[PDB]
């Protein structure tokens, strides 16, 4: 169950290997717009949080 738009639910992801390639089990996305980064280069750059 997702939260309201005003009470947008936040989780911090830290200390974990990020497999951003488990996104592509959820069906054709009306939008996957990756701003400032590429949808392909994201599974490479390490990040703090």
Partner 1 sequence: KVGGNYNYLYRLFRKSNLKPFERDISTEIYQAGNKPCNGVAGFNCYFPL
Per CB under 8 A, residues contacting partner 1 are 23-24, 28-29, 32, 38-41
Rounded-to-integer distance, Cα 47 and Cα 49, Å:
6
Least separation in angstroms between residue 45's CB and partner 1 is 14
**Shortest distance (Å) from residue 23 CB to partner 1:** 8
Gaps in the chain following residue numbers (C to N > 2.5 A)? none
Which pairs with CB-CB distance under 8 Å and at least 24 residues apart come from 20-28?
A: none
Nearer to partner 1, 18 or 32 (CB): 32
Q: Please, what is the minimum distance in Å from the beta carbon of residue 29 to partner 1?
A: 7
């Amino acid at each position: 169950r997702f939260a309201s738009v005003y009470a947008w639910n936040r989780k911090r992801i830290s200390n974990c290997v990020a497999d951003y390639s488990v996104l592509y089990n959820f069906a054709p996305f009306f939008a996957f717009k990756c701003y400032g980064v590429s949808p392909t280069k994201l599974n490479d750059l390490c990040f703090t949080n």
